[PDB]
Write an enzyme that holds these catalytic residues in place. Structure first.
Site, PDB file in Angstrom:
ATOM      1  N   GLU A 226      -3.797   9.716  11.832  1.00  0.00           N
ATOM      2  CA  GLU A 226      -2.496   9.081  11.637  1.00  0.00           C
ATOM      3  C   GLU A 226      -1.970   8.570  12.977  1.00  0.00           C
ATOM      4  O   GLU A 226      -1.998   9.285  13.979  1.00  0.00           O
ATOM      5  CB  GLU A 226      -1.499  10.081  11.036  1.00  0.00           C
ATOM      6  CG  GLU A 226      -0.178   9.481  10.558  1.00  0.00           C
ATOM      7  CD  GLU A 226      -0.302   8.617   9.308  1.00  0.00           C
ATOM      8  OE1 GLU A 226       0.665   7.886   9.000  1.00  0.00           O
ATOM      9  OE2 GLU A 226      -1.351   8.655   8.629  1.00  0.00           O
ATOM     10  N   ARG A 227      -1.497   7.327  12.989  1.00  0.00           N
ATOM     11  CA  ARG A 227      -0.799   6.780  14.149  1.00  0.00           C
ATOM     12  C   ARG A 227       0.618   7.346  14.125  1.00  0.00           C
ATOM     13  O   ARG A 227       1.293   7.285  13.094  1.00  0.00           O
ATOM     14  CB  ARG A 227      -0.782   5.249  14.104  1.00  0.00           C
ATOM     15  CG  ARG A 227      -2.169   4.623  14.093  1.00  0.00           C
ATOM     16  CD  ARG A 227      -2.123   3.105  14.093  1.00  0.00           C
ATOM     17  NE  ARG A 227      -3.418   2.531  13.719  1.00  0.00           N
ATOM     18  CZ  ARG A 227      -3.879   2.395  12.471  1.00  0.00           C
ATOM     19  NH1 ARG A 227      -3.168   2.786  11.412  1.00  0.00           N
ATOM     20  NH2 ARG A 227      -5.081   1.859  12.277  1.00  0.00           N
TER      21      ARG A 227
ATOM     22  N   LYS B 217       0.827  -1.207   0.000  1.00  0.00           N
ATOM     23  CA  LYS B 217       0.000   0.000   0.000  1.00  0.00           C
ATOM     24  C   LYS B 217       0.866   1.264   0.000  1.00  0.00           C
ATOM     25  O   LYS B 217       0.662   2.158  -0.823  1.00  0.00           O
ATOM     26  CB  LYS B 217      -0.923  -0.013   1.223  1.00  0.00           C
ATOM     27  CG  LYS B 217      -1.984   1.075   1.254  1.00  0.00           C
ATOM     28  CD  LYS B 217      -2.821   0.971   2.520  1.00  0.00           C
ATOM     29  CE  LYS B 217      -3.534   2.274   2.840  1.00  0.00           C
ATOM     30  NZ  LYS B 217      -4.269   2.174   4.131  1.00  0.00           N
TER      31      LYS B 217
HETATM   32  N1  LIG Z   1       6.299  -3.107  -5.730  1.00  0.00           N
HETATM   33  C1  LIG Z   1       6.912  -3.959  -4.872  1.00  0.00           C
HETATM   34  N2  LIG Z   1       7.928  -4.761  -5.277  1.00  0.00           N
HETATM   35  C2  LIG Z   1       8.551  -5.619  -4.437  1.00  0.00           C
HETATM   36  N3  LIG Z   1       8.208  -5.746  -3.136  1.00  0.00           N
HETATM   37  C3  LIG Z   1       7.203  -5.007  -2.595  1.00  0.00           C
HETATM   38  C4  LIG Z   1       6.482  -4.051  -3.457  1.00  0.00           C
HETATM   39  N4  LIG Z   1       5.556  -3.461  -2.688  1.00  0.00           N
HETATM   40  C5  LIG Z   1       5.666  -3.986  -1.443  1.00  0.00           C
HETATM   41  N5  LIG Z   1       6.644  -4.910  -1.385  1.00  0.00           N
HETATM   42  C6  LIG Z   1       7.045  -5.682  -0.178  1.00  0.00           C
HETATM   43  O1  LIG Z   1       6.016  -5.654   0.822  1.00  0.00           O
HETATM   44  C7  LIG Z   1       6.474  -4.996   2.010  1.00  0.00           C
HETATM   45  C8  LIG Z   1       5.376  -4.123   2.626  1.00  0.00           C
HETATM   46  O2  LIG Z   1       5.052  -2.988   1.822  1.00  0.00           O
HETATM   47  P1  LIG Z   1       4.207  -1.750   2.416  1.00  0.00           P
HETATM   48  O3  LIG Z   1       3.928  -0.788   1.287  1.00  0.00           O
HETATM   49  O4  LIG Z   1       4.889  -1.256   3.671  1.00  0.00           O
HETATM   50  O5  LIG Z   1       2.811  -2.440   2.832  1.00  0.00           O
HETATM   51  P2  LIG Z   1       1.699  -1.735   3.773  1.00  0.00           P
HETATM   52  O6  LIG Z   1       1.848  -0.246   3.578  1.00  0.00           O
HETATM   53  O7  LIG Z   1       0.403  -2.301   3.237  1.00  0.00           O
HETATM   54  O8  LIG Z   1       2.047  -2.218   5.162  1.00  0.00           O
HETATM   55  C9  LIG Z   1       7.741  -4.244   1.614  1.00  0.00           C
HETATM   56  O9  LIG Z   1       8.675  -4.161   2.695  1.00  0.00           O
HETATM   57  C10 LIG Z   1       8.280  -5.054   0.452  1.00  0.00           C
HETATM   58  O10 LIG Z   1       9.180  -6.078   0.892  1.00  0.00           O
END
Ligand SMILES: Nc1ncnc2c1ncn2[C@@H]1O[C@H](COP(=O)(O)OP(=O)(O)O)[C@@H](O)[C@H]1O
Ligand SMILES: Nc1ncnc2c1ncn2[C@@H]1O[C@H](COP(=O)(O)OP(=O)(O)O)[C@@H](O)[C@H]1O
Ligand SMILES: Nc1ncnc2c1ncn2[C@@H]1O[C@H](COP(=O)(O)OP(=O)(O)O)[C@@H](O)[C@H]1O
Ligand SMILES: [Mg+2]
Ligand SMILES: [Mg+2]
Lengths: 475, 462, 469
Positions: free
Chosen positions: B183-184, B157
């Site tokens: 926001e947290r 996300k």
């Molecule tokens: N486009 C992408 N390509 C490769 N890995 C991804 C991608 N998007 C997310 N990830 C993996 O998923 C993990 C969580 O992403 P994040 O955006 O923080 O999710 P959320 O915001 O839903 O918690 C990242 O640390 C990464 O390892």
């Protein structure tokens, strides 16, 4: 400076005068009972009474203190049982301390923090592996009555023995003999001497239930801002919320959903945000929060549950169906979340837990085929055999928290298939004898996980488990 | 200008008496000097009578005393705008919370204002090319549109949000705004550092209305971020992005304020001004003749009930949905956008071309068929499938891998450099797969590439 | 001028001192030009609902009488113009220069003032015109979920009135202003704007303007009705109006009931749609046709507000969500959609050709979710479904509709594959317009169907030239 009481009733007094009183100021009635100014109105001050009100009458005089509510803090409160005002209830003398902190205190800002990277081990295999809690995190424990919520918090507190973490158990709205039972359980497991017990029982005035979590938070914050680490438990915020509702409704603030006022979310968010992980510049200390919510018939979409779910960093959902079946602790892994996740785990646990969450998801998903025995293909056959064995490892007895090094070997053994040979009913006995074997003989593999935080040589570990497996006798 | 006295303090509500014939307008910011240092800002809500004004507090009311001076600022909460806001973190009042020095903006604009006039508005739907293959093809964003972002924890996300900021800034020259409604504080700190590391910090202004602030603060924080987004549209003609996380917590804040003011509740306990408040926020997010603001909005659904007044009122304004699926993230398919569940109002022959629509629907029909046969394949086997299905299954697996894409922001995770793929290249690539031009290539070739030419280029290396 | 002073105000509802001689429901004007509505006349004060922005109105603010009952401008000055519920122009094309005005609140025609609906209002949409035909003076509910094609039916109906001497009023209540701007641009491109009035109260507009919007549009339509002409009014939508009126009622602390709505929420819509009618010969013979919208949640037609409007209108057109998102557009639910007027709203040819068409398709859809006899009905059903599918913004003349429906129902497309039916229709009408124009012109002039034998030969003549897949 001075004001006289107009009307009194139900732990609330409306006071004439006190023209320069602050919002939230501490007040003193003529008989020595304290009060707190909550409502400042055009012609009166609405005061919540922090004690008995049978001697408070019309014409009774009230004095300004010019101060907000403070509580005693520090090492003197360790091992003691206190009320939200910091007064001792255990009958073991006064609390000698020079250090004091305010009950209402601002949380650390966005720039005062560092990402949560340090484990806070509960000692519970289901929580530590798949719903890991980190130092500074706020993790909700939520479920119906008699699902094992309090036990999880007590076992977490017991597991902090010798880990240099100050624990704080805040009891709100409980029966006082039940609180007396909790402190005795902590005493028997050698957990009390690093623990502060704040109790506002059901017979106490509503303001003390309202103020109990904030008092316990302040006691935890002392250690946080001094560079040390602390754990606070609110058991529970449902009864705290209801106590604040009582006062708001008595002060005629407008009711909303389930008769709660518009600042009940603000109440809990202001509380829980004070729990944090500080930056290197601010000393690096932390306060970990474990708020409780008692749901009614599993209604997680009720108002107070909805508030505390969204505020926190994750939820450990407990359920009655699992509890009655014998899955204890009764943790629903599918819906339970930890947004901190892998960052709150050591490298050894993070590696083994990946297969565990995968295997357990596929088992409960494909549990419809379980009754249809021996009709299935060998792909789904072995996954059901693996799945029911991992459930037995995730079962755990009351007041027996496991060290993280012993957890990872137990999870490593079941996930790589070293218990597929052993029957289903013997898995828990196989675990207990395996860890007894590992502690005595193969301590070098355990000590590697303690020191480095990583798995030892896998082929050496495989060899160590196989020596035990030959010595084991199934049944 | 007008000066008054605090007569009542009741939680986050403050009644202030002013002199006759000189009262603050509704939604005016009113500053109150605290006895123990600092300034409380309150917002004028109701004129009760006898020159008394009921106000909603934007910070704590503890420490206030009856009789303190309250100064009418003469306008709503006014916040800085322009390039001084870029790379900075703000609160509801437009003050910096990043401890990064002064914010030297030339102008300050009020957060309360009417939506754009009828004559200013754009009269036709235009695609906003994100450069992301799955979104542009199957659920395209519209200029001035509103997108519902759905997805669990740890599915991509935050990475998707950062990539949209990067791609619109790089190719379209459109800046961004992030509004953290409820926001947290832990997650606001993480998001700030995550956006610093990726480099998209410089293209974004951040505004947090944190969980531990009063309901008034969390209610108006989206308007603060919105006002910053409006400057770049109206003054500099940009196609701006406005992220709102979470839009439910904006509605939640309104309900809480409504309860504090003592209004009669509506259906399901919501404020009676539910549609009005949502509409006055959402209508300002639109496409004008000069530019646009496109908004990606995270939406909580109470009790998983889409007919609930909060999501139902929100869905009235949405033009698309980006639905992130955990199972795709587990397979390695990033971005993990569900190609069947994600939808868009502008996926038609009118807005995008006839070819785009034909190819997009063909991809959906192939992927839907593959999804239906999962239970049949798992038990009966591939021999159970007919000769038509075997080919559809083969193309669907190639299609599912070609929908994945390496991101500029996710170079640390994937390893490869990021790719911006235009719409025409995306349409052409999936068209050629459906026609059967690349049936003989291996499936790994289609995984994690930009254009169809890069897939063919990868095939020789395998 | 007679003046008053505001003493209390909140959420756009004010209490005013003075205005001694003011009427109930009178139009008022504040200092800054914003308009108001005197709702309640109290003993010492007046209750005033503000009909615009209220961020410059406060205690001490002054307000004056206009001496006029709540009203709007009307007539030919509003044709091709975009206005708000007060009649103020939003398009920026100068002021509405007019001497004619009509009141917001106005009595419906009596029992003797009406005549039975007998004149077609052609939508140009095959599914509607054949199965759920609308007549001049009828009230026909358009009901369905979000994004099920409601507005498109109304706009295509309005476009189809080009050269028919019917004034159109599109009332937008609580919609996005983007879509209203898109609508007016669509009408400009199809040359439908110059006989159309656009009343709009968007989602950012305060609730009292959403409340008043349908009554302002009704008044604008009524002007033409009572002068002998015919008009069409579209309320898009009454769910936003109902919700807006609920806000006003809850702010006034009036006792809420089912889904928190006030007790006069049925009366809100019932008095609105009663004013739509077909007048008698004595009263000029004019009419006002109403197409009120209701937006359901998850297809729930049994909810409070949907059942209120079903209880007012002369039948309804329900738009099914599952059909709409599986190729079938317009997604008319044949099982529960109905026109009370029915055959009386159709020409003779359309009535005879599509006489049992609704129940035949209702039977087909029942048999679909389930032999040689019933196999023929499934094959016929699939082909008739393809004919009733239709592109947006492409109205079909009634003479072309009846020929297309005649062909499929009598079995001239049974040997043709199902995927070629849409192309078969298009090419058949090109053949019919170019060569056999006398058959189409017979339907235009008389209204009756041509010779059976001559039409059958003309279709069979085309089938020789046609080539299937
Ligand atoms: N486009 C992408 N390509 C490769 N890995 C991804 C991608 N998007 C997310 N990830 C993996 O998923 C993990 C969580 O992403 P994040 O955006 O923080 O999710 P959320 O915001 O839903 O918690 C990242 O640390 C990464 O390892
Ligand atoms: N892991 C466990 N194994 C066996 N018994 C347990 C376990 N956890 C809790 N219990 C027992 O079950 C009961 C659960 O109640 P409790 O722990 O107080 O949860 P709650 O606070 O939700 O009522 C307690 O009496 C406790 O002794
Ligand atoms: N007959 C049709 N053929 C193709 N597209 C259509 C048709 N009717 C409606 N649409 C499209 O479907 C979408 C929904 O239609 P709309 O009238 O906006 O529904 P609602 O007003 O109920 O939300 C619009 O984007 C419109 O362009
Ligand atoms: Mg308990
Ligand atoms: Mg519409």
């Amino acid at each position: 400076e001075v004001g006289t009481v107009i009307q009194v009733g139900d732990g609330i007094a409306r006071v004439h005068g006190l023209e320069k009183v602050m919002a939230g100021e501490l007040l003193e009635f003529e008989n020595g009972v304290m009060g707190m100014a909550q409502n400042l109105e055009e012609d009166n001050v609405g005061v919540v009474i922090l004690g008995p009100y049978t001697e408070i009458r019309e014409g009774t005089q009230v004095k300004r203190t010019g101060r907000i509510m403070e509580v005693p803090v520090g090492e003197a409160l360790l091992g003691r049982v206190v009320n939200p005002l910091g007064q001792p209830l255990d009958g073991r003398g006064p609390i000698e301390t020079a250090e004091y902190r305010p009950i209402e205190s601002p949380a650390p800002g966005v720039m005062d923090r560092k990402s949560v990277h340090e484990p806070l081990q509960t000692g519970i295999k289901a929580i530590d592996s798949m719903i890991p809690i980190g130092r500074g995190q706020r993790e909700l424990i939520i479920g119906d009555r008699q699902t094992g919520k309090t036990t999880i918090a007590i076992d977490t507190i017991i597991n902090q023995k010798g880990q240099d973490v100050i624990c704080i158990y805040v009891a709100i709205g409980q029966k006082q003999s039940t609180v007396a039972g909790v402190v005795e359980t902590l005493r028997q497991h050698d957990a009390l001497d690093y623990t502060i017990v704040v109790t506002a029982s059901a017979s106490e005035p509503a303001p003390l239930l309202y103020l109990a979590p904030y008092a316990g938070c302040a006691m935890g914050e002392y250690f946080m801002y001094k560079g040390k680490h602390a754990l606070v438990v609110y058991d529970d915020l449902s009864k705290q919320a209801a106590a604040y509702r009582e006062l708001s409704l008595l002060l005629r603030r407008p009711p909303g959903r389930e008769a709660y006022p518009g600042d009940v979310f603000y109440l809990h968010s202001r509380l829980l945000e004070r729990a944090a992980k500080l930056s290197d510049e601010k000393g690096g200390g932390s306060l970990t929060a474990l708020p409780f919510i008692e749901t009614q018939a599993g209604d997680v979409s009720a108002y107070i549950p909805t508030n505390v779910i969204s505020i926190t960093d994750g939820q450990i959902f407990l359920e009655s169906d699992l509890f009655y079946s014998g899955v204890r602790p009764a943790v629903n892994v599918g819906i339970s979340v930890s947004r901190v996740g892998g960052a709150a785990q050591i490298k050894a646990m993070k590696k083994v837990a990946g297969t565990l969450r995968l295997d357990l998801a596929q088992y409960r998903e494909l549990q419809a085929f379980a009754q249809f025995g021996s009709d299935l293909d060998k792909a789904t056959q072995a996954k059901l055999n693996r799945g029911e064995r991992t459930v037995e490892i995730l079962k755990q007895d009351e007041h027996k928290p496991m060290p993280v090094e012993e957890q990872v070997i137990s999870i490593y053994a079941v996930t790589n298939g070293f218990m597929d040979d052993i029957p289903v009913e013997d898995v828990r006995r196989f675990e207990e004898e395996l860890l007894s074997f590992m502690r005595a003989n193969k301590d070098s593999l355990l000590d590697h996980i303690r020191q480095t935080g990583e798995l030892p040589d896998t082929k050496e570990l495989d060899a160590a488990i196989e020596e035990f497996k030959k010595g084991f006798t199934p049944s | 200008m007008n000066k008054g006295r605090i007569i009542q303090v009741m939680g986050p509500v403050v009644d202030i008496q002013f002199e006759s014939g000189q009262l603050p307008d509704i939604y005016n910011a009113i500053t109150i000097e605290r006895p123990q240092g600092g300034t409380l800002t309150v917002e004028a809500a109701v004129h009760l009578g006898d020159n008394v004004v009921r106000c909603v507090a934007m910070a704590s009311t503890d420490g206030l005393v009856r009789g303190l001076e309250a100064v009418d600022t003469g306008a709503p909460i006014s916040v800085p705008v322009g390039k001084a806001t870029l790379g900075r973190v703000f609160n509801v009042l437009g003050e910096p919370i990043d401890e990064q020095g002064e914010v030297n903006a030339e102008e300050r604009h009020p957060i309360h204002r009417p939506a754009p006039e009828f004559e200013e508005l754009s009269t036709a739907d235009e695609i906003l090319e994100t450069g992301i293959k799955v979104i542009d093809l199957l659920a395209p964003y519209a200029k001035g549109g509103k997108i519902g972002l759905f997805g669990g924890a740890g599915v991509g996300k935050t990475v998707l949000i950062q990539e949209l900021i990067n791609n619109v800034a790089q190719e379209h020259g459109g800046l961004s705004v992030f509004a953290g409604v409820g926001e947290r504080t832990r997650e606001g700190n993480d998001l700030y550092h995550e956006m610093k590391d990726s480099g998209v910090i410089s293209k974004t202004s951040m505004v947090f209305g944190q969980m531990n602030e009063p309901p008034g603060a969390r209610l108006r924080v989206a308007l603060t971020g919105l006002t910053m987004a409006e400057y770049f549209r109206d003054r500099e003609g940009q196609d701006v992005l406005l992220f709102i996380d979470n839009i439910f917590r904006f509605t939640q804040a309104g309900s809480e304020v409504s309860a504090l003011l003592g209004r009669m509740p509506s259906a399901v306990g919501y404020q009676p001004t539910l549609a009005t408040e949502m509409g006055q926020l959402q209508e300002r997010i639109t496409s004008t003749k000069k530019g646009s603001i496109t908004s990606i909005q995270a939406i909580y659904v109470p009790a998983d009930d889409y007919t609930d007044p909060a999501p139902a009122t929100t869905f009235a304004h949405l033009d698309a949905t980006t639905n992130l699926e955990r199972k795709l993230a587990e397979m390695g398919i990033y971005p993990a956008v569900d190609p069947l569940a994600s939808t868009s109002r502008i996926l038609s022959p009118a807005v995008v071309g006839e070819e785009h629509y034909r190819v997009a629907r063909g991809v959906q029909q192939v992927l839907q068929r593959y999804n239906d046969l999962q239970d049949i394949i798992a038990i009966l086997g591939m021999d159970e499938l007919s000769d038509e299905d075997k080919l559809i299954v083969a193309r669907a697996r190639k299609i599912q891998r070609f929908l994945s894409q390496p991101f500029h922001v996710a170079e640390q995770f994937t390893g490869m450099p990021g790719k911006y793929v235009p719409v025409k290249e995306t349409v052409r690539g999936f068209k050629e797969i459906l026609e059967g031009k690349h049936d003989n290539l291996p499936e790994e070739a289609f995984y994690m590439v930009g254009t169809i030419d890069e897939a063919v280029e990868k095939a020789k290396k395998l």
